[model samples]
Target: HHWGYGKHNGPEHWHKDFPIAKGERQSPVDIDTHTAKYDPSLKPLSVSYDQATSLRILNNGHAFNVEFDDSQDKAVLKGGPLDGTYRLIQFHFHWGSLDGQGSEHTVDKKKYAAELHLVHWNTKYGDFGKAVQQPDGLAVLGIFLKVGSAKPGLQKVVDVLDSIKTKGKSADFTNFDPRGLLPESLDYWTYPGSLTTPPLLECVTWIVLKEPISVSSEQVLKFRKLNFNGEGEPEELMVDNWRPAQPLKNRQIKASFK
Candidate 1:
């Protein structure tokens, strides 16, 4: 069995199987707003996703991912500390047991209700399969989710949660726009880090947005309805599916805004 976010096989025991869990460039680090220096060289982050085709949504037992067609560079990310175009791959969210805390990266020790990750692969690397081992192969856009008014955009995603409530379950989610889930402001903090999940490859250039997207209490509860267990296994509510902040280890977090 693989590692999970449980006490016995959680982030604490990840290093046993995935030795790189203790690596220097681990992800989900705390963002100290006051200490992050404003970088004038950082450009405004841009996403060209209109032509990017969303294929489907699935519950991978860890998180629900909306897959996209990346064969073409139709949906790609550019600017904001990234050197080349990064194609959109899949997008997912991490949440907590309660609305008080669930996000991966924190701001000045502040925890949001949840977080969204729009994962992308560097075009120069050929493909995501080969780029996994490189230094700068992935760019994950982190958007904090705050509990407040219902967002029509986010609601579209939440509406499909019921169809894939159990592990390994998925449904067709075509024509969905990833931009709908983004915050109004793209201002963010950039850093070098790894994927927050197992195999925890240190290949990501993390961009945590300054603004948060709104989600209602009702819509937020739907995520909890997911079953971490497989269809035949006993039900285990998929809650607190997030990794805590790791050590910064002399890494510098650059802010795009002053």
Candidate 2:
């Protein structure tokens, strides 16, 4: 289940974990070709990944991004569950188009150098294993990454890249939480769709934050530095890790408290 890209890869089983259409709104895809059919955008949400409940760090050698286990809790959006608790599974980034010009969801078709996905499953539906089967099972946080100055919030994550610079190698950070790196608000747009991966299922409730957390040039380089080009004996660095966007199929993109 933790294997990287492959024909029978975990991406194919996204719907098995999301219970949706299997590929309607899945993520990690290249967003340059997505058609803007539905546009019910919402305000960005403010979030903070509690470090205490989440302190495990794994460097899969693909990217320096961190994954939060049992780390997500609390929702601060209007017209949404007030005190819902979701368990953090893993979070990763996607990039493409050119050197840095591919993302899943584009703002006015504007692609960022990359996109970050903080994937979580609704604990109410049960643990990560069971939640992925229900319609209201998983809640994934999406953020667009544009090149800019270093975002103070992202330092908590970017700082640890040096520790886990090898594949299958990981380090621990007791003083880290996913919330610390989130933006300062919780205004978000909600909608029904599937994960952007193949075998595309429509079983995800996407909460894409309108406001993206800032990331500096150094931080951006920190991610790209791990580019896996299918090199020699060692695993290739992470270079092209994004999936292409799919058709909206005349779906209505809904927003909360819009």
Model 1 pairs whose backbones collide: none
User: Pairing residues by index, what is the TM-score of model 1?
Assistant: 0.98
Model 2 Cα lDDT, one tens digit per residue, 170-231:
66765555565566665555556665654344557777666677676777777655534222
Off-target runs (Cα >4 Å) in candidate 2 are 1-52, 61-65, 69-84, 96-100, 197-201, 227-232
Q: Over 4 Å off in model 1, which ranges?
A: none
Error of 1 at 21 (Å): 0.7
Clashes of each: 0, 42
Cα error, residue 230 of model 2, in Å, equals: 9.9
Candidate 1 lDDT, 1-258, residue by residue in tens: 578988888899999999999999999999999999999999999889889899999999999999999999989999999999999999999999999889999999899999999999999999999888898999999999999998888777899999998888999999998878878889999999999998999999999999999989998898899988888898899999999999999799999998
lDDT of each: 0.93, 0.57
- Find the 10 residues in a row with the least total lDDT in model 2: 74-83
Best by TM-score: 1
